[PDB]
């Protein structure tokens, strides 16, 4: 893909088509629904899960005591550093996974389409196909809904594609 | 100061919300508190890569 | 005229549920417990020397 589409407001992934009937755009429900489900599960894991701790050691001192003070400071500092490391690593990993799952859903949709147009189209390489037959808005709908039959348009597209 | 509200996490700076997994207000906590970390901000992505148009 | 050829993987009627990053609960063929939670109830005299 080259960039994104700012005009999409009823979904996250979609299709743009230019045929003899004009130019149109429409989003895909299933892919964006799956992405939303995964991110909501991620948030449900992270947010709202905090355990209780009531009585602990002291962590601020107004006096000079020596050994025990040194040990308590060391313990709290070690705990803090380890938990901060864990937090930074968890955030990095979860964000990488979010990016990966979104890109995977985009590629899933692209492949689902490409396999539907078996020989009636070619991959131009810019995230856009070239369909080699007269395909109207109803034909585009048959594509996206999953009802497109290649046999109907197969011979015409093979002709316009090899001669 | 003592107020009249509801929060299950108390720090010497006041009560704080107990939804985010981490916090850096203070390390001295009482209740269902998020863990103290040194980071001032850790942001979690809730959307795909953004290449504008 | 022409033949078809399918690619697939196996499965089992009774899988077990595990946890990953994507899914809190997902079913796999077989899995092993990593948390020893059972004990006999007695202390073994070997290999460590014990003094009751």
């Amino acid at each position, epitope marked *: 893909i080259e960039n994104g589409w700012e005009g999409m407001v009823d979904g996250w992934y979609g299709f743009r088509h230019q045929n003899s009937e004009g130019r149109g755009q429409a989003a895909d429900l299933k892919s964006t629904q799956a992405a939303i489900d995964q991110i909501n599960g991620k948030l449900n894991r992270l947010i*709202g899960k905090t355990n209780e701790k009531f009585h602990q050691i002291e962590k601020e001192f107004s006096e000079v005591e020596g050994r025990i003070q040194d040990l308590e400071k060391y313990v709290e500092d070690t705990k803090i550093d380890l938990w901060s490391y864990n937090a930074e690593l968890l955030v990095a990993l979860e964000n990488q996974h979010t990016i990966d799952l979104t890109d995977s859903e985009m590629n899933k949709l692209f492949e689902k389409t490409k396999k539907q147009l078996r020989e009636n189209a070619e991959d131009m390489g810019n995230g856009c196909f070239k369909i080699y037959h007269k395909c109207d808005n109803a034909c585009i709908g048959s594509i996206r809904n999953g009802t497109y039959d290649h046999d109907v348009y197969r011979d015409e597209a093979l002709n316009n594609r090899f001669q | 100061p003592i107020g009249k509200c509801n929060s299950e996490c108390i720090t010497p700076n006041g009560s704080i919300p107990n939804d985010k997994p981490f916090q850096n207000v203070n390390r001295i906590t009482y209740g269902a508190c998020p863990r103290y970390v040194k980071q001032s901000t850790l942001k979690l992505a809730t959307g795909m890569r953004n290449v504008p148009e | 005229p022409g033949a078809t050829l399918c690619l697939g993987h196996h499965a089992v009627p009774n899988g077990t549920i595990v946890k990953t990053i994507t899914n*809190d609960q997902i079913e796999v063929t077989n899995a092993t417990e990593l948390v020893q939670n059972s004990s006999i109830g007695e202390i073994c005299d070997s290999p460590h020397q014990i003094l009751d």
Partner: antibody
Amino acid sequence: QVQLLESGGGVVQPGRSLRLSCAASGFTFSNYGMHWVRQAPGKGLEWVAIISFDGSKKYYANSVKGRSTISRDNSKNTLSLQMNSLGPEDTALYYCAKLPSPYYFDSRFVWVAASAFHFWGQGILVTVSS
Amino acid sequence: MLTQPPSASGTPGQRVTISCSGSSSNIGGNTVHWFQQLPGTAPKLLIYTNSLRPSGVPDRFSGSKSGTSASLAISGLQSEDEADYYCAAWDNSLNGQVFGGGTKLTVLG
């Protein structure tokens, strides 16, 4: 939490029509698609209708299709249901509820959340008999 | 309609499981969810997106889904869990919400 005043229950003669309405407060009603579900006495849980957060999408069950209408007002924060040609298989409790549904029924602002806003109203009893 | 066995049973602390079979139109394509109805009261939401529990729900209730089969497990079942449990999912063919028959679980008295 959610404070809803429900209204419209009662007894309605066969062949006549019922009209229920539950008014909600305590949240942004303006961005949650709503459901009407029903529960016949004895047992059972049958779904009736669903309406988008802007009316743009309504859908009914084949069992009550063609004789019912779901509607909503975001100004008065009101959800409402109308059903005609009632028979004994329609005497039941009617719940106005926010169930989990496809994402496009709710607004853009609530697509992603760790909360999953939800509620079922108490039953609204309608009975068709002499 | 969705297929839930009429009855379930167990002993206090047994981790019972309820199942829910569907079709390619609803479960194979969409997520499921699970509600609990205590006798004489409105149903309450337990599970959504096949494994997610809302704020109120304890982690004793868990869910799963594979293909056309969803499952709802209760680990530490106790005195206050005798109720009705409903599995439901969105169907794209009917373009609606299809519920399950319903399952009554009883404890070892």
